[PDB]
Amino acid sequence: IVGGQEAPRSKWPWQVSLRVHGPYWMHFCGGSLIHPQWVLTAAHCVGPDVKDLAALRVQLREQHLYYQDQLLPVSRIIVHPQFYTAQIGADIALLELEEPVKVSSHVHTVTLPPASETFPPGMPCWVTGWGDVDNDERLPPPFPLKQVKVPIMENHICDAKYHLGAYTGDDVRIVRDDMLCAGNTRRDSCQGDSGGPLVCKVNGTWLQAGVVSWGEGCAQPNRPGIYTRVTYYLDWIHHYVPK
Amino acid sequence: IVGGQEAPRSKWPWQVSLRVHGPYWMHFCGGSLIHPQWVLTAAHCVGPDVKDLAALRVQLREQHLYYQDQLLPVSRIIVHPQFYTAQIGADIALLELEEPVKVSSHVHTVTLPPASETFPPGMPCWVTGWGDVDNDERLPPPFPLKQVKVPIMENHICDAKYHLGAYTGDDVRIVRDDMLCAGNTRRDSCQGDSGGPLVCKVNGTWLQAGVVSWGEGCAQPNRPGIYTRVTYYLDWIHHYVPKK
Amino acid sequence: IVGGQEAPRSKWPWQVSLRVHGPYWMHFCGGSLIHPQWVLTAAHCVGPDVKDLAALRVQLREQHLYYQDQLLPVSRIIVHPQFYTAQIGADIALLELEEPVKVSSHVHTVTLPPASETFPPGMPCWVTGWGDVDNDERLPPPFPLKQVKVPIMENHICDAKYHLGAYTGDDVRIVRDDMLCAGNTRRDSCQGDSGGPLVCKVNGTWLQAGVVSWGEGCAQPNRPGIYTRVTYYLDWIHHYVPKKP
Amino acid sequence: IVGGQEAPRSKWPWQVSLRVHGPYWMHFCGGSLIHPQWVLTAAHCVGPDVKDLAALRVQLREQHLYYQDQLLPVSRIIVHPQFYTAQIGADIALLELEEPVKVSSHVHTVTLPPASETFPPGMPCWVTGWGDVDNDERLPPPFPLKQVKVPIMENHICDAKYHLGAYTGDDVRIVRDDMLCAGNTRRDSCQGDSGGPLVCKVNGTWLQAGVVSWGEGCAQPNRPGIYTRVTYYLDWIHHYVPKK
């Protein structure tokens, strides 16, 4: 997270850390708990190439990475079959846990928006994770969960920004209809925040608008964060995840 | 180049090295001379973001990188307006030199194919450059230009191989119609060969079939090298580059 | 620490972490609390060149590096005036804290040995720190304090081992009289353990025998860990550090 | 070499490059040809731990590293038996070549000074090599042999400089009597120049005053280059190397 602060302990009870087997169980991507037995993440975190399930674990919300680890095994990785790269799109995956989690005030699910929900430009949303604090600048120990308020921006405006200082023809889409855009040169997601949630508070309810997907670096001029648009893939999510 | 040998001095007179300004004028991509004033390369080497022309130079064919440098400034970078990433496609760009080069037996242009040429499997094709000799393994000094004969494979076969060990749906095309596929687990292009030529000898004439574009690593199982198909972009090239 | 275990919370209440200012307050060396206001470390951690005191802080015993940091500023760095390199010797330094710390069962001073104590082979000795777990292999998060029991070896035996597979003449001493030797191919200190304590339990009392100084890599054949011999430098320590009241 | 220039092709015909076996025969240290069959170098380049002779080669003077290599095998490494570290001293070694070299105007031996020779402070001397051009800055391709003029400085003055901004007691020797000192914040030897020669022209003859040994970085304030004093070890050298 670029230009963020440490999250209060009470905030973002749905944030999860994805861990890969090595010298230690290292954080590589974020996720959100959308159901007691399901994590929503980015496809690029776990694909497009098939990964060994034995080398993957989920860690539920912890204030500091690695200090109080209770690693959960994954029974199934479901990557959207249309996914190959984040820039093409369908950058969305589901992790099925071997067990449902026992939910509490400190650990519980995020609400998905209805299909009709159109998060208007300028709406204050929050992105959370344990990713880099700037370009090629890792989160220092003790690795606090960070948060940043980012304004949602119209897809057409974000597409136009990605064309400034680029050879790509103005009529050739960079930011596609299954993508959502947020952030500026002070406030953005970064490497290691991938798969984590963009959440917006609507009528007293936190709704997951986005999954951290891609961008040209972090908080670069005219290069806002690109997110998978959750409303676009609700039918695909609901094919696997109970309502 | 993976599984190659050092090129003989007489071979590949169209091979060029692209150089970026830093502590020294460092090789980052290959290219081909297609006209005395024009270099064909990959868009991903010079884009999609607009870069300072003053920090780019072209080096014509040398047997050993850096030893006999005569660096040429660039007047113009022209990147295909459809290009954003190599995997989406249109991975093709043109460099206009500030001056036309004097051609010779040792330094001269490659011939572009006619639109009808498909380059079927079994055709003898070669890829050349100063790129890595394996995954994360740089070409050692004194940096000889390498060559390797790569077997062309049909786009549908290569598309099917890219789906093996992948979550991507079988009917979601990975290897696109503007791309060409070549190489195996012994013979491939690698990092630093990007933008360089894939050339096939057809009726005694060398034709540039491909621009080194992308792949999953180098010489990996079921992951052959992907090249921009030059025949697909001839009309765009001919918009900028004069006929002989 | 090579071939160690995580230290129990009750052990090594004198272990300190030295921190350098950067993107964060990063661990670079170990140390020992020998007085409420004084830390014993290796000279090579803080010298031979004079460094900015404002860029150095001390962290008292923590079970996991960085998790519960209460960083203490330093008023004075005192490096042995004979020190230039660890291999020449006098690899010993003192940090004066700006304030005396409040001691407890969990955080308190280590006892220095009497001048007469030689620490012979067979004596049970432990080395502790947050250093590498092997050659070029960092301690993983969450960075637990590690301990390992190291066999002390006689200086003459260790000197002879350092000459095996070396061009250095047998009568040219490598392991010097102000140094102490401990460890084997399974048990050793490593990069990041430097300045930390080697402690031996003598008649029910923990005594600091050594300061982690140097070696050829970590846990390598015929290359045991070299430590500054504390007994050699007691008079220099007692020049600066007041005796217990 | 820091603050240097590329050597003219006619200069320093005694300069050699030491090569270690890896992906390629990589330069790690310099040396000087003091006899047709003997190279003088720094002990720290080849010790104190015993190295495999099969993994070591010598390359005689070349203008550009790696481009025209003719690698020579070594029959014997002789490291001074007093050597353990450069800071303690005796940082001097001899390589015996398997064959004597055929000498020419372009490749021939440097003259060693007489025991009586005292190179006075301020004397213009030259250090040569393929080492770093600054702190953590490698010599760029095509790796030209570099030279820099450095004034010799009195051991007592150089010892005093190493004590400025240091905790070391002023009466505790850093720069020892078997060492020689040269260079400033613009002009110095660096990593990769180790074992190479410091040469001074005395009565029309180039004499090797020093072997590149150690220092605190390259061209740092009050930290001039430290060299092994050749006059100190003449008797040891002449124990193995036949006199001219």
Author numbering:
A (entry chain C): 16 to 258
B (entry chain B), D (entry chain A): 16 to 259
C (entry chain D): 16 to 260
Copied sentences from the primary study:
Among these proteases, tryptase, a tetrameric serine protease, is one of the most abundant and functionally significant enzymes in mast cell granules.
Additionally, we solved the 2.06 Å X-ray crystal structures of human Tryptase beta-2 (hTPSB2), in both its apo form and in complex with compound #1, experimentally confirming the binding mode and the key molecular interactions predicted by docking studies for this compound. In order to explore and validate these binding modes through molecular docking, we generated X-ray crystal structures of human tryptase beta-2 (hTPSB2) in its apo form. The structure was solved at a resolution of 2.06 Å and displayed the typical trypsin-like serine protease fold.
